[PDB]
Amino acid sequence: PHRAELARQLIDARNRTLRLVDFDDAELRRQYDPLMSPLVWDLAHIGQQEELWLLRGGDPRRPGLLEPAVEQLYDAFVHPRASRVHLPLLSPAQARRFCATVRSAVLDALDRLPEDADTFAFGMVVSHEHQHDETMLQALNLRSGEPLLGSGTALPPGRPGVAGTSVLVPGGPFVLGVDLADEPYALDNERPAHVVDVPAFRIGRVPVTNAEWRAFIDDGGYRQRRWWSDAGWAYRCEAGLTAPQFWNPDGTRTRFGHVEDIPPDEPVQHVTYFEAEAYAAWAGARLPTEIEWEKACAWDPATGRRRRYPWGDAAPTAALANLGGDALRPAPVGAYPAGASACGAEQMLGDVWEWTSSPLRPWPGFTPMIYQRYSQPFFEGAGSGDYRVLRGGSWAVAADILRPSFRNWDHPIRRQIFAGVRLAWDVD
Ligand SMILES: N[C@@H](CCC(=O)N[C@@H](CS)C(=O)O)C(=O)O
Ligand SMILES: CN(C)[C@@H](Cc1c[nH]cn1)C(=O)O
Ligand SMILES: [Ca+2]
Ligand SMILES: [Cl-]
Ligand SMILES: [Cl-]
Ligand SMILES: [Cl-]
Ligand SMILES: [Cl-]
Ligand SMILES: [Cl-]
Ligand SMILES: [Cl-]
Ligand SMILES: [Cl-]
Ligand SMILES: [Mg+2]
Ligand SMILES: [Mg+2]
Ligand SMILES: [Mg+2]
Ligand SMILES: [Mg+2]
Ligand SMILES: [Mg+2]
Ligand SMILES: [Mn+2]
């Protein structure tokens, strides 16, 4: 909002990016997994997108620092993830230089903007950079070899009495989504604020834990097709799923290259949508819709009002939620009692992205932002395949870019993302 605050947010995002690529050139060029770009791709792409949206008015016909053919190497629509390791990409030195030149021009542009000028694009780019920072963390977690990152900063302890339990979300109208007047940098798929009727339902007080997931494995959950959808079972069989990713046969897990015991009370992480819906069915429950999820997060039934965050309007802090990337893991369930929503659901923001049963769809009145292909190509039926929405952010998401209305999405077969499960139930 204040130009100084935007500059601070862009600088904070770039600091984060540069820490994540502060390794030798050969590391940045490696393909850690065919699902993921080499880190050097995301680095140059971050700069190219910043240039496009802030210096070139989102018009690719306007000249950029790079030749158009070079610039198009960083267009995700043209280049599948797996192919990017073989593309003739900018070197790390070239990419850093390019990023720095763009940033210098962007900070100058910010200083020159007329009073009361619109600054939406600047906040959109802050969001874009942080989201690629989480993508790069996914890649670093997939990397085979001795750890490049540490084990993460301290988190609060969990507490007993929350795991497995649910809270009631009384039925009726609520306001879904937000307007720019409320949230000046809400992305296009979050808008507009509008009323929806949501029947009474219950939602998990905390996410499903590792120890709870182990019970699903031990009971033969991955060997019993009745819990799975037709597509989910087919995929389970094709991919040979038998446990969350990174769980090892000896009962340990590998997290950013660190082999460690699986903590029993941590939210389960790195499971597919198909695994999530199967666990839910086996447990006597289901997945929430994203609309149910957002009502549980943001609505205060005592006041008939939306809250800015589940806890109220206070900016996120380390006492309220696990965000920002430093922990490199979710916190034990029950670790954030003060971060509870009005209905009592805890850890809705931060820790793990939570699968929902909803495909990405526009709210009525949707209109695209300057980056018109950010949401639209991935709407249900738009021709890009199947997606399911995830909510709430993970331990890796910057507080600056997260809201109850924020919408992530991915193919249901993906689990290298930092994703877990929160249950829901019908109420008769
Ligand atoms: N989530 C999709 C990938 C979506 C995607 O391509 N995102 C661009 C955004 S620039 C990227 O390559 O990072 C998948 O895993 O298949
Ligand atoms: C929201 N998320 C799925 C997008 C965000 C993004 C980054 N660049 C373009 N879109 C993605 O990772 O592809
Ligand atoms: Ca969450
Ligand atoms: Cl792109
Ligand atoms: Cl660390
Ligand atoms: Cl509020
Ligand atoms: Cl980080
Ligand atoms: Cl489609
Ligand atoms: Cl898919
Ligand atoms: Cl149900
Ligand atoms: Mg800030
Ligand atoms: Mg206990
Ligand atoms: Mg209650
Ligand atoms: Mg309003
Ligand atoms: Mg038993
Ligand atoms: Mn991008």
DSSP assignment of 173-239 equals: EEEES--TTT-TT--GGG---EEEEE--EEEESSPPBHHHHHHHHHTTGGG-GGGS-HHHHHHHHHH
d(CA 10, CA 311): 26
> Phi-psi bin for 108: left (phi > 0), alpha (psi -120 to 50), beta?
alpha
Say yes or no: CB of residue 35 within 6 Å of ligand 2: no
Answer whether 329's CB lies under 8 Å from 158's CB.
Answer: no
Distances (CA, A) of 179 to 186, 313, 344: 8, 16, 25
The resolution in angstroms reads 2.0
What ligand has the least distance to the C-alpha of 307? 6
Give bridge partners of residue 260 from the DSSP assignment: 253
Angle at 102 between CA 89 and CA 66, to 5 degrees: 40
Q: 359, exposed or middle or buried, with CB in 10 Å at 0-12, 13-18, 19+?
A: middle
144 appears as a binding residue in the annotation: no
Residue 332, CA atoms < 13 Å, CB-side half-sphere: 16
User: Structure solved using which method?
Assistant: X-ray
| Ligand 15 geometric centre to CA of 225 (Å) | 18
Indicate which atom in ligand 1 lies nearest the CA of residue 410: 1
Say yes or no: CB of residue 414 within 6 Å of ligand 1: yes
Q: What is the largest CA-CA distance in the chain?
A: 64
270 appears as a binding residue in the annotation: no
- Domain spans, the chain: 1-151, 152-428
| Ligand 16 geometric centre to CA of 317 (Å) | 27
Indicate which atom in ligand 1 lies nearest the CA of residue 417: 15
| Ligand 2 geometric centre to CA of 313 (Å) | 27
Return the closest-CA partner of residue 130 out of 36, 46, 7: 46
Choose the residue to mutate in 37, 360, 374 for probing ligand 2, maximizing ligand atoms within 8 Å of C-beta: 374
Cis (ω within 30 of 0) for the bond into 192?
A: yes
Answer whether 331's CB lies under 8 Å from 162's CB.
Answer: no
| Ligand 3 geometric centre to CA of 361 (Å) | 20
Determine which residue's CA is closest to atom 6 belonging to ligand 1.
Answer: 76
Say yes or no: CB of residue 409 within 6 Å of ligand 2: yes
